[PDB]
């Protein structure tokens, strides 16, 4: 038995932090909330693989 | 282990400046007049 | 006296008689002047140690009212406790504004 | 004529804390005004707090909640701890 | 006859130096003199009140300290 | 070659000079005749002790010092170094008077 | 017959005298002090009653709302100087309009 | 379920009938007036207690109420309150 | 031809409208959950009467009105019509807080 | 109920309270600063309310607890529970 965290939302900004080694803050706009999160370069590389843009769930 | 996902604010968080913090205790305050005037005039 | 067996310095009979003749209530308990001498002894010991260290800062073996003024005003709980109290011959704090420099 | 002050008690607590530094007479009068003022503070708050509960008896409960209400939490915390320690050690 | 002008302008200048004031205009001495004129009536009237209630012809230090007791100022020092 | 200070130097050393002194800045005789002058029209033929005059002068001096500090911060809020009459009315009115 | 009618009073002397006895003020209580206290409280309460009564007469209402008492107290200088920190519930504020904000 | 409570309803209604016997009073403003008389009672009572404590006396008379009213009130309210108070007291003591 | 007011007109009639009203401007339920929220971490499982909530809301409303009047006069001293954060810190600090 | 009830006070409510005070134009940080002053104020009164409620041996706060709580602070709130 194990618990896992689930994140989802509409992508608002894909931008480095302010200075960098290339990480990307992904601002996920959900319905009931808006939060920004910082990710690893590998999951950001898969984000570049999925060909997402501004406004994709 | 190392979390690949990190929640972060836009205004409060900066990637460069990282800061972490937590009979009667009382901070030490110098009652010297020349120390306070020496601090305020430098 | 009952101050030495309880670890007190201020007398219990003077405070108990002052509460009796001070027109506060009809019945007066026995632990209330002991509690009052405990609180007044702790607070007076606090002003004595803060004014004592404030006298130790300026290299003087006597307590002037300026040492008590800086000892009270430099503490946050003493300034919040007594904000309207005017101390004679205590002076003011060396507060210099930054924009006037 | 006679007068009442706290000279020997403040001198004794002075000898208990730091028995090197002396006290002037004027600052001793300021401390006498301080104890004489806080005595009227906790005494008057005990009188009004005893009047609020429709009771004619002032106990250590009224001094405890009175000290807890007119002081900050540090001074009321250590004053309540040392006060209950002196009272329970006295009884 | 006009003892309110006994307070000099360099006295108010020195009291401005105690407060951290750099430059002082012209009406500051008149306005401060008026505030002091109202203040001495506001304390001295209560001093004559307690002196008249005390059945005395001489004002003492307990009259001044007890006069400032009800106003919340609680002046220590002389006559505490 | 005369030696003169620029405007703004002597005020700072006057702050350093008077802020280290606990003496009274008002003389005893104009405050005496002033206190007797206000005491003239209230009750005739009164007496004043040798005490209770430096208490009024002390509370007047320290209260006027705190009023000059609050009025000084009020003039600081106006982004200037000069004190004005509206600063005294502002800092006087905002203290509850 | 109570002693309020022979002295020209409305508030009772026995309730104020017993309240001063059981109020923990002093050991000995005089006989003219509750009469003086009912005189002062009767004059002051009559003053608030006539000022709030005329303030109710200004807005053409036969009942006293707390706004009439609020304007009656705040419009007087001695009542504002006497009570400056007193908050009146459902009394509103005064129509104070600044001159520089006008076009 | 209620034993008894004390208020100034009939007295404020009677002075209301003495001043303007047309305008009525709501219950909430009557409670505000009850808080007013109950507050000023503690004001003059507490000032009489401290003023009696200042003179080293254990007796509170009309002198302490007179100088207390003269010290805690402005000169108009203390003047007419002192005049009407001394009129009611000296008119009261003349009956005997 | 649309009919629009110039900026500065509706604020005056809002002053005339709300200054004649003695009603409360804060709803009962967010103030209820706010009072219970501050009362949560002090003492657990408390109860509140139907009274003593409009007293806190009344003193909060009138005290905030007087704070907005003193802060409004503080913004008047700055020779502008806009209220700023330093006006709230100025009028808050100069009242003895 | 237990999570961020400080945001229940709306921005037009603070705008209406600014209209009660005679304010014409309102900036952005006024609602946050006023919300912070209200947040400190409700702790400053409510803490004394829990103090008198704990001293009164009661689990329910009454009007006398609020009026007597504001009595010692010099505010002297009349009206309800005087």
Domain G1-103 class in CATH: mainly alpha
G90 with G66: CB under 8 angstroms?
yes
Can you give the residue range of the structural domain that contains I75? 1-97
DSSP for H67-94, please give it.
HHHHHHS-HHHHHHHHHHHHHHHHHHHT
Q: Is D27 exposed, middle or buried (0-12, 13-18, 19+ CB in 10 A)?
A: buried
D23 in helix, strand or coil?
Answer: strand
The CA-to-CA distance between both ends of chain H, in Å, stands at: 43
Alpha carbons C55 and C63: distance in angstroms, whole number: 6
The 3 state secondary structure assigned to chain G is CCHHHHCCCCCCHHHHHHHHHCCCCCCEECCCHHHHHHHHHHHHHHHHHHHHHHHHHHCCCCEECHHHHHHHHHCCHHHHHHCCCCCCCCCCCCCCCCCCCCC
Tokens found for residue C85: 């109290």
Query: Alpha-carbon distance D89 to C7, whole Å?
Result: 9
Alpha carbon distance E40, F38 (integer Å): 7
User: Please, which residues have CB within 8 angstroms of residue I46's CB and are 6 or more apart in sequence?
Assistant: I36, I39, J50, J53, J59, J60, J61
Mark yes or no for CB contact G23/D51 under 8 Å: yes
Please give the full DSSP string across F60-91, using - where no structure is assigned.
HHHHHHHHHHHHHHHHHHTTSSEE-HHHHHHH
How far off is chain A from B21, nearest CA to CA, in Å? 21
Q: Residue D9: is it exposed, middle or buried by C-beta count within 10 angstroms (0-12/13-18/19+)?
A: buried
List beta partners, residue F16: none
The experimental method, as deposited, was cryo-EM
The DSSP secondary structure of B9-31, one letter per residue, reads: -SSS--SS---------------
Domains and CATH numbers, chain J: 1-82 (1.10.20.10)
Fold topology of C1-101:
Histone, subunit A (1.10.20)
Phi/psi of residue C64, nearest 5 degrees:
-90, 160
For residues E50 and E56, give the distance between their C-alpha atoms in angstroms, rounded to a whole number: 9
CB within 8 Å: G25 and C24 = no
Asked whether the beta carbons of G65 and H26 are under 8 A apart, the reply is: yes
Burial bucket for residue I58 (CB in 10 Å: 0-12, 13-18, 19+): buried
What total of structural domains would you count in chain I?
1
Assess F38–E contact: CB distance below 8 Å, yes or no: yes
CATH of the domain at D57: 1.10.20.10
Q: 3-class DSSP state for residue E58? A: strand
Nearest to F11 by CA among E31, C96, C70: C96
H helix runs in D1-91, sequence order? 7-17, 25-52, 60-70, 73-90
CB pairs under 8 A between G and I: 35
Any idea where the domains of chain C sit in the sequence?
A: 1-101
Distance CA C35, CA C41 (A): 10
* Total count of domains within chain D: 1
Residue C18, token pair as written in the block: 């002052």
Residue H10 lies in domain: 1-96
CA distances to F94, G100, I83 from I70, rounded to whole Å, are 7, 16, 11
CB contact under 8 A, F85 and E16: no
What is d(CA I97, CA J21) in angstroms, rounded to the nearest whole number?
20
Q: What is the resolution of this structure in A?
A: 3.6
* Residue position matching structure tokens 């009407």: H84
- Intra-chain end-to-end CA distance of chain A, in Å: 29
DSSP 8-state symbol, H20: -
What's the full length of chain I, in residues? 97
The residue of chain D with its CA nearest to that of C67 is: D27
Instruction: Using the CB atoms, write b or e for J56-71: b if 16+ within 10 Å.
Output: beeeebbbbbbbbbbb
Distance CA I93, CA C90 (A): 23
Cα(B15)–Cα(B9) distance, rounded to whole angstroms? Answer: 10
* Distance (Å) from the alpha carbon of F13 to chain C's nearest alpha carbon: 12
C101 has a chain E CB within 8 A of its CB? no
* Other Cβ atoms within 10 Å of G78 Cβ, number: 15
Q: Quickly list DSSP for I51-87.
A: SSSHHHHHHHHHHHHHHHHHHHHHHHHTTSSEE-HHH
What is the C-alpha separation between E76 and F58, in angstroms, rounded? 10
d(CA B18, CA D12): 51
Identify the CATH number of the domain in which residue I30 sits. Answer: 1.10.20.10
CA distance E2 to C42: 52
Cβ-based contacts of J74 with chain I (< 8 Å)? none
């Amino acid at each position: 038995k194990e618990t896992k965290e689930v994140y989802e939302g509409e992508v608002t900004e894909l931008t480095p932090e302010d200075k960098t080694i290339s990480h990307v803050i992904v601002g996920l706009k959900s319905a009931k909330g808006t939060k920004t999160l910082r990710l690893d370069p590998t999951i950001y590389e898969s984000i570049q693989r999925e060909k997402v843009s501004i406004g994709d769930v | 282990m190392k979390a690949l996902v990190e929640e972060i604010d836009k205004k409060t968080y900066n990637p460069d400046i990282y800061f972490t913090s937590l009979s009667r205790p009382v901070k030490r305050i110098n009652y010297s007049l020349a120390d306070l005037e020496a601090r305020l005039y430098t | 006296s009952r101050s030495a067996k309880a670890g007190l310095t201020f007398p219990v009979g003077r405070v108990h008689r002052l509460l009796r003749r001070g027109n506060y209530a009809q019945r007066i308990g026995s632990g209330a002047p002991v509690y009052l001498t405990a609180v007044l002894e702790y607070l007076a010991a606090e002003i004595l140690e803060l004014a004592g260290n404030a006298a130790r800062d300026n290299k003087k073996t006597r307590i002037i009212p300026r040492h008590l003024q800086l000892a009270i005003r430099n503490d946050d709980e003493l300034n919040k406790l007594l904000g309207n109290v005017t101390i004679a011959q205590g002076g003011v704090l060396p507060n210099i504004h930054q924009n006037l420099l | 004529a006679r007068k009442e002050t706290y000279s020997s008690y403040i001198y004794k607590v002075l000898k208990q804390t730091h028995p090197d530094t002396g006290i002037s007479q004027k600052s001793m009068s300021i401390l006498n005004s301080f104890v004489n003022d806080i005595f009227e503070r906790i005494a008057t708050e005990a009188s009004k707090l005893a009047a609020y509960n429709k009771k004619s008896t002032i106990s250590a409960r009224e001094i405890q909640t009175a000290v807890r209400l007119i002081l900050p939490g540090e001074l009321a915390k250590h004053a309540v701890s040392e006060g209950t320690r002196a009272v329970t050690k006295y009884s | 006859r006009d003892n309110i002008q006994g307070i000099t302008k360099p006295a108010i200048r020195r009291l401005a130096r105690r407060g951290g004031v750099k430059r002082i205009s012209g009406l500051i001495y008149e306005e401060v003199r008026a505030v002091l004129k109202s203040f001495l009536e506001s304390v001295i009237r209560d001093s004559v009140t307690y002196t008249e209630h005390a059945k005395r012809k001489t004002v003492t230090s307990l009259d001044v300290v007890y006069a400032l007791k009800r106003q919340g100022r609680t002046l220590y020092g002389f006559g505490g | 070659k005369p030696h003169r200070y620029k405007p703004g130097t002597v005020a700072l050393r006057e702050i350093r000079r008077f802020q280290k002194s606990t003496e009274l800045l008002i003389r005893k005789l104009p405050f005496q005749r002033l206190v007797r002058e206000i005491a003239q029209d209230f009750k005739t033929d009164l007496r004043f002790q040798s005490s209770a005059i430096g208490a009024l002068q002390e509370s007047v001096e320290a209260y006027l010092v705190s009023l000059f500090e609050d009025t000084n911060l009020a003039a600081i809020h106006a982004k200037r170094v000069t004190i004005q009459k509206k600063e005294i009315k502002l800092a006087r009115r905002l203290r509850g008077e």
